[PDB]
Structure formats: structure tokens, C-alpha cells
Amino acid sequence: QVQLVESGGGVVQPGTSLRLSCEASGFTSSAYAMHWVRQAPGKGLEWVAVITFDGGYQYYADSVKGRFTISRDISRNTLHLHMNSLRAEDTAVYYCARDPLTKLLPFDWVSGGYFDYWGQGTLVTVSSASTKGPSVFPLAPSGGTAALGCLVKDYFPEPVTVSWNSGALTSGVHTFPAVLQSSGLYSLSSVVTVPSSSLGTQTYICNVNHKPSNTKVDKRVEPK
Amino acid sequence: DIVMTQSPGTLSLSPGERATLSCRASQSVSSSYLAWYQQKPGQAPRLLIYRASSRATGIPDRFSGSGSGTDFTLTISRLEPEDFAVYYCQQYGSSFTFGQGTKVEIKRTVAAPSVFIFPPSDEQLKSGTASVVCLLNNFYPREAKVQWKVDNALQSGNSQESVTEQDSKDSTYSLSSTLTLSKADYEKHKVYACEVTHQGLSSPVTKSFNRG
Amino acid sequence: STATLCLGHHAVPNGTLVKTITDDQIEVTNATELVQSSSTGKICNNPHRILDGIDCTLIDALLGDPHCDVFQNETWDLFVERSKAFSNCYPYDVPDYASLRSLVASSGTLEFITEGFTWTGVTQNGGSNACKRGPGSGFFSRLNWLTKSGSTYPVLNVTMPNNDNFDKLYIWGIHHPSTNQEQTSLYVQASGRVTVSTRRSQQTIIPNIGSRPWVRGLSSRISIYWTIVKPGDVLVINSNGNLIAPRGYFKMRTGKSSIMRSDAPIDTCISECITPNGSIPNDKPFQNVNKITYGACPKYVKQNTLKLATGMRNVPE
Amino acid sequence: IENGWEGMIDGWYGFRHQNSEGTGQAADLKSTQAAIDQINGKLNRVIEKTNEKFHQIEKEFSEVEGRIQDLEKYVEDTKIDLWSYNAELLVALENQHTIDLTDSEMNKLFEKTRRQLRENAEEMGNGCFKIYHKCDNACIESIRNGTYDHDVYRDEALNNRFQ
Ligand SMILES: *[C@@H]1O[C@H](CO)[C@@H](O[C@@H]2O[C@H](CO)[C@@H](O)[C@H](O)[C@H]2NC(C)=O)[C@H](O)[C@H]1NC(C)=O
Ligand SMILES: *[C@@H]1O[C@H](CO)[C@@H](O[C@@H]2O[C@H](CO)[C@@H](O)[C@H](O)[C@H]2NC(C)=O)[C@H](O)[C@H]1NC(C)=O
Ligand SMILES: *[C@@H]1O[C@H](CO)[C@@H](O)[C@H](O)[C@H]1NC(C)=O
Ligand SMILES: *[C@@H]1O[C@H](CO)[C@@H](O)[C@H](O)[C@H]1NC(C)=O
Secondary structure, X not given: OOEEEEEOOXXXXXXXXXXXXXXXXXXXXXXXEEEEEEEOOOOOEEEEEEEOOOOOOEEEOOOOOOOEEEEEEHHHOEEEEEEOOOXXXXXXXXXXXXXXXXXXXXXXXXXXXXXXXXXXXXXXXXXXXXXXXXXXXXXXXOOOOOEEEEEEEEEEOOOOEEEEHHHOOOXXXXXXXXXXXXXXXXXXXXEEEOOOOOOOOOOEEEEEEEHHHOEEEEEEEOOO | OOOEEEEOOEEEXXXXXXXXXXXXXXXXXXXXXXXXXXXOOOOOOEEEEEOOOEEOOOOOOOEEEEEEOOEEEEEEOOOOOOOOOEXXXXXXXXXXXXXXXXXXXXXXXXXXXXXXXXXXXXHHHOOOXXXXXXXXXXXXXXXXXXXXXXXXXXXXXXXXXXXXXXXXOOOOEEEEEEEEEEHHHHOOOOOEEEEEEEOOOOOOEEEEEOOO | OOEEEEEEEOOOOOOEEEOOOOOOOEEEOXXXXXXXXXXXXXXXXXXOOEEEOOOOOHHHHHHOOHHHOOOXXXXXXXXXXXXXXXOOOOOEEOOOHHHHHHHHHHHOEOOEEEOOOOOOOEEOOOOEEEEEEOOEEEOOOOEEEOXXXXXXXXXXXXXXXXXXXXXXXXXXXXXXXXXXXXXHHHOOOOOOOEEEEOOOOEEEEOOOOOOOOOEOOEOOEEXXXXXXXXXXXXXXXXXXXXXXXXXXXEEEOOOOOXXXXXXXXXXXXXXXXXXXXXXXXXXXXXXXXXXXXXXXXOEEOOOOOOXXXXXXXXXXX | OOOXXXXXXXXXXXXXXXXXXXXXXXXXXXXXXXXXXHHHHHHHHXXXXXXXXXXXXXXXXXXXXXXXXXXXXXXXXXXXXXXXXXXXXXHHHHHHHHHHHHHHHHHHHHHHHHHHOOOOEEEOOOOXXXXXXOOOHHHHHHHHOOOOOHHHHHHXXXXXXXX
């Protein structure tokens, strides 16, 4: 059936330029109005750009006017978004969407249409930070039946993956969303609750994998 | 520029209940040209309604849209566990603009958090800084308030936190709060405390440690 | 004093001409094109599965012409017959060549299944220098040239049931010797005869001796015939000479498969409409490129432009 | 009217006034949006996809064959003549109706305005109204935004009109 597949995001420094692409399968791109819609992490949906089936008009949101140009390639049935002069506020996952209604659109204030099909997204991280590997530190146990975990501090960029005993331990595990420190580096925590009479006999190893930096760390957690 | 204003911030309802979300506009749309999107976490949004009342192909009969002019609503007749997600609305009466989104969560029963506090790791402090962590484990509802107090000195501006998504079994939240300090400031004081207040606690619960 | 309020509409310096029921030419503010008239120039390898025949025709590939052996067990959505295609095997001809090419192209698969035929009394795997494969003589890979064994060519009466749940296409042939000398020297009888038949259907060819124009050395020929066997139905081959036996069957399918003749190169891109002139976008309702079409396409029309007025009448001063 | 205003670049229909304060030009949006909405729906009907067709018949040939080739040719020729006429008729109707609907949209904007100024104005025949009362930039925009009351200027406008 009909499919949208976006391509070409990544970590890139502020001010620089970057082109995103959206492959259309299942329909002719020239027969539809095509949109870009983005979503900053945790935030909500924001419309960004539109190109008529014509290729004849283009309209942009004020937050990107001047800097973002939207284009189509009839010949490759592909849709592009040329981003210039990027900045940290632009950091989002960028969706490609199809519009079965908008056909004629000759002013920036006329009616458009709804988004029929959506791609799955490509992530644009705009930051000055350089690729750092995480430093994994323990969170020792002290209750009824206590808890432990790993602190994964100062890494860039997302994502890391955490597991416990290489996947053997899933129930009772919470791995929190990574927060951006003011340093520009990420940091998160993973914790787990376990039987307290078992601390002396069972072993708990958290497995931290951050492949943007080819870092992989196995640290153990234990009282005192 | 038409602005789209959704209410409430978060919904919460028990499964099987009827939901009803609101979307109001800064002007008149222009033909009820108002759409509704559902977006589960980690997924692209999927279209539910267009022209304010028309179901999209392959959308169950329980989602219904209504409204005209300025005030629109989305009604979910019965709430199945698949329906807990963020709901945005979008107008195309003039250009295209999105609402801010209404998360509908599961309303379970009140759950007190379980509090844990973790002094910094020995390895960390010989690299200049020290992190103090606080765990708020499996609570409901989401609204909680943590406060750090170093030697009963109310702390501000140096701690961050994150919250997990509503758990898929017990429908609870968990919260992690990290107090970044310098090594320098850390060996000045002794009593490090994390004070939690939450609907499921009669009086605030304080977990703490002395240094050594 | 007083006030004056004027109403009006916009206009533009240069508008576009369009046709209406009365007026042949009439300026409006904008118009769009309803007739697609251009082609990239190349055929797109997606979403359709395009098979470039290169130097092979579909029939050669079907039959087993040596340089078309790469096309064995092959499948296509659209088979593309280049114009540089030649035959380099035994000089053949197919009665109803058009129908064979079509019925195969629609089936979209050369998936062949060899079968255990038993030709007691004759010498299998005949070959020729008009059909070189490797170091010496050879033949069509999907056909068995049967000739006399010893001083004898017994009457062949073999049968093959169809016990699967699909349809079997069989390709076989008959041989036309240039002379009587060649006739008896190969198939000891003086006049051959092949009768291939199912339960409901029957056909039988008598060979025809005589000189044809010299092609790749030979002045004799092969005539290619086919037979389809439905489930439960059964094939019966009966011949006392000149038979070109089937080694087995092609599987028959029904789908959106076809064949097209075109010299446009194939490229890696997307497009749902294919013409001999290359792929074209089917955004507009009509096209003027080629009446020959494959896939979701605008309808071929004679006009090269039809402007749809996309605005009001344009009146300047 | 008389002709159009190349200087209008923000809409399709609109007003131009001359007053006490100056002379202004503002485009009406709803009527523009109505004409655009139609022409748009139109497009949606014509671009509305195509028909899938795969294995057909052959339409080019290398050799003379008589009867069957003749038929195969005539069939395709007939088809093309028929879809050609259909295409030629389609744009003609769609365009006549397009033009028809866009000047009708003017005559409902003008008729909307006349019903506002009940009898505080007369129509010159120009595509314009002579307003018989003081009317600043705030007053005509009350006409534009549809928010104009005639009983206010009624006593005033009936005067200049009748003597
Ligand atoms: C006719 O349609 C074309 C588009 O098909 C319009 O061209 C655009 O006009 C805007 C400004 O009005 C430019 O910023 C765009 O870049 C133009 N795009 C192209 C592809 O030309 C044209 O304005 C229309 N004509 C009228 C009179 O409205
Ligand atoms: C040629 O081969 C066929 C084999 O198919 C022979 O026909 C069979 O005859 C017997 C009775 O003698 C039937 O019971 C079988 O069912 C027939 N086979 C079928 C229907 O496939 C036939 O006898 C052979 N002819 C000669 C001259 O040997
Ligand atoms: C072709 O395919 C059939 C079944 O898929 C198999 O039996 C046969 O051996 C294959 N032959 C070649 C040459 O791939
Ligand atoms: C397409 O090819 C035909 C014949 O091959 C030719 O007559 C016609 O002009 C071509 N159309 C193009 C290249 O647009």
C-alpha cells in the first residue's frame, strides 16, 4: 500500500546545513500536497512546510521561514527539506505527511487539508556537543526490601541502552528518560527493586551500551 | 494565525469509561475543517477524524467527532486499553495549525511512592563532581513534589528530574531526581535529605543520610 | 463631503489561455495542465519487478536458447524485450507466435519443473552446431531431440498425469528435415507424426520435408507447439518419428504480469506508470506519450495539452 | 464591474474606498475562500486517480497480417478517439463552469453589500456605491467586516440623497 520513508537526520552542529528526504511508495507524490511536520522531544506536533502537487506554491511556519526550503523531485518520487542555518530549537523528529485535500492553495492564509498518511520519522539533533562516552556509576542499596541501580552520566548523543544481567532481569526495572545537563551532555538513571535477603548471594550487573561512541560498560552494584 | 487550544492538560479515566476531549479555536475555522490525530508513544500520529465529524478509514466506531465554528470535541464512547495516548487536533481552515495535545492516562487507585536515596559513588567524586539521586518508586497519580535540603538548607536550581511513562501493568509512575553538586561544596555539609510530598502520603516523607 | 465604495476582482498582466464550450481561446488568471506529455526517459525498477531481456526474446528464454539460459526459473511483473535481441539456436518458428508470447508473459514466470519421461527405444539429448552450448553442439535446454536407437525408431506412447492443484504448460515441437536422406537417417520411418493430447483436447502434426533458406548452417526447421493440462486431466504423447519431446512443464499463474518492447534504460527510482518511452507520473488524468501502457496510467489522448482553468476570467486594462 | 485590479495580490475579491481620511484597498476573504474551495474540489475530482491496467493487447506490429491486425488497430483507434473527445469536452465544461462560478461569486458579494447599506447609498453602476454620509476608515471597515448598522447613518444619509 502507501508508504512514507524519511531519511538523513543525525547529530549536526548549529548554524550548519542539512537535507532531509522522504521516499513515497504506493502513490504518485505529484498528485498530492506534501507536508513536513516536526515534534521536539517530549513536546507536541508542529507544522513546518507544505508543497502543492503542482510544485507551484510553498508555505512555511514563521519559526523556519527564511531558513527552510521544501522541494519535490517528480522523477525520483521523493520529497526533500533543505534546512539552513540550523539551531538548537530545531531539534526534533521530522515527519513527512500526505494531504489528500489541499490542491489549489494560492495564498498563505487559505484552507489546507488533513494528514492522511505519515512516515515514521527521522531524528535531527542540533547541538554543539561532541560525542562523549557515558561514565557509569553505581547506586548502592541500604527498608522492607531495598533497591539499587546505575547512574549513567555525561554522554552524547542519545541513545544509550541499559539492561540488567544481560536481559535476565526485567521485572521491577525503571530506566528514566535522559535529561540534558547544562554542560550539553545527557545523563540518566536506571534502577531496580530486588529481594533484600538476596543481596549477599545474587549479583547485579548493569549493562550500558552507547554505540555512537562505541562505548560499552558493565558495572556491578553492591552495599557498603 | 488560528491558535488551537485543547483541554484538559491530561485526562485520566478508568478503562471502559467514556472520554471527551475539547478543542477551541482563536477564530472561526472555515468549514469545520478540523482534524483529530492519535499518537501512541514511539509511533507516528495516526489520523482519526477529518472535517470535524468524518471517521478515517479503518477507525473503530467508538471514536466520534463533533462541533462547528470555534468549539469542537472528540468523544470516545468506550475506553479500551489501546486508547490511552496523546490526542492532537489540527485545523486547516486557514493554513495548518496544531493543538497542544491532551494525554489521556489510566485512572487507577491512589498509590504512595516508595522513597530511596543514594549517596554519590566513590569513583565519581575523584573526578571533581558528585551526584545525589532520589527514587520515587511506583506511585499514582503523577503529581509529586520532591525537595532537597542540605543541612536543612532548601536547595534550588541544581537538581533535575525525569518521570517514566505510566506503567503498563500497575499503571503507576516512577520519578528520578538528581542533585548535581561540586566535590568542593559536597564535603562542607553532613545531612543530605530528599523530601517527598504526594497525595498518597498523610504527611511528607523524608529520606536522608549522614556522610560516613 | 461624501464617500465612494468600489468593488472588484483581481487580475494579472499575463494570464493563461483556456478553452470553453463557446470560446476557442479565453484568458483566465491561472490554469493547470491535464495532459502529461513528458517522460524522464528511463523505466523505473520499482514498484514493478522489471526484467530486462537484453539479447533474449521471451520465447528464446522460454525454449532454452543457450545465451538465454540466465533467464531460467525467472519471474517478472513486466518483461522488457530489447530490439537487439537475436536467436542463436536451431532455426524455429511458432504457429500462433503472438498467442504463446502473450499467454506466457501474463503468467509472468519461467519456473520450469523437469519431469521423469521415459523414451524407451530412442536416443535422447540430440544436438546441433547451430545451437552451440559450451565447447560443441547443443540444443534448447527445455526440449529433448529424440532420434533412432540402433536401426530402430519405435512408436512412442508415453503419458504424464497432472496430479498437482495448478495448471501445467508443456512446450514441445516437431522436426522438418530438408531431405528424405536426413529424414530416414534420423527417424527411421519415411513420414513422421506427432499427436499430443489431453482428455478434452487434441492436436497432431505431420512433418514436412523440404529445403528452407540456409540459416546458421541448416535448411531444416523446428515447429513449436504447446499444450496446457488442467488438474485431473492427463497428457499423452504419441509419435512414430520427428518428435521434439518436452522435458517437463512450466507452472501457470494468473496475475498482473505482462511484456513490453522498449529500448529505454532501466534505472533505480519509483514510478507506477510505464511506457516504451520510459516511466511517467500519473498525477494528471491524461497522457500523450504512448498508447502503450503498463500500470496505473493517465489515459492516452491525441491532444498534447488540455488546460484546466484554475482561476477566474482575467481582465486587465 | 469594469475590469480587475492588478494591484490586488493578497486575495481574489475586495473593496476600494474613497473617503474623508484617504483611499484604501482591502480584500474580502470569505468570498475568495468560497471560489477557491470550489475550484479546489473540482481538481480533486479530475486528478482523482486513474485506472490500473496491466496486460492488454498489442498496439504495434512488425508484419502485415490482415483481418486480425486490422481489428486490433481499429479497436485501439476507436478507444483513443473516444477518450480524446471526453478529455476535450471535460476541460470545456469544467472551464465554462469555473468562469461561471467566479463571476457569480462577485454578484453575491456586491448583493451582500447592497443589502447592508439599506438606503444610505445609491449604486453608481460602476461596481461602486455612492455613500451619502461621512464615513471614515473605521466606518467602511465596519462594512467590510460586515459589522455596519444603517439606522445610525439613516437619518443622516436619507438627507443628502433627497433634496
Ligand atoms: C499561477 O500559479 C503559479 C504556480 O503554479 C504561481 O507561481 C508562484 O507565485 C508565488 C507568488 O505569487 C511565488 O512566490 C512562487 O514561487 C511561484 N511558483 C511558481 C512555480 O511559479 C503564480 O503566481 C500563479 N499566477 C497567478 C496570477 O496567481
Ligand atoms: C498408450 O498409453 C496409455 C497410457 O495412458 C494406454 O492407455 C491405458 O489403457 C488402460 C487399459 O488398457 C487403461 O486402464 C488406462 O487407464 C489407460 N491410460 C490412461 C487413461 O492414461 C494405452 O493403452 C497405450 N497404447 C498403446 C498402444 O500401448
Ligand atoms: C527451478 O525451480 C524448481 C522449483 O522451484 C526446481 O525444482 C528446479 O530444480 C529449479 N531449477 C533451477 C535451474 O533453478
Ligand atoms: C514515444 O515513442 C513513439 C514511438 O516510439 C514516438 O512516436 C513518440 O513521439 C514518443 N513520445 C515521446 C518521446 O514523448
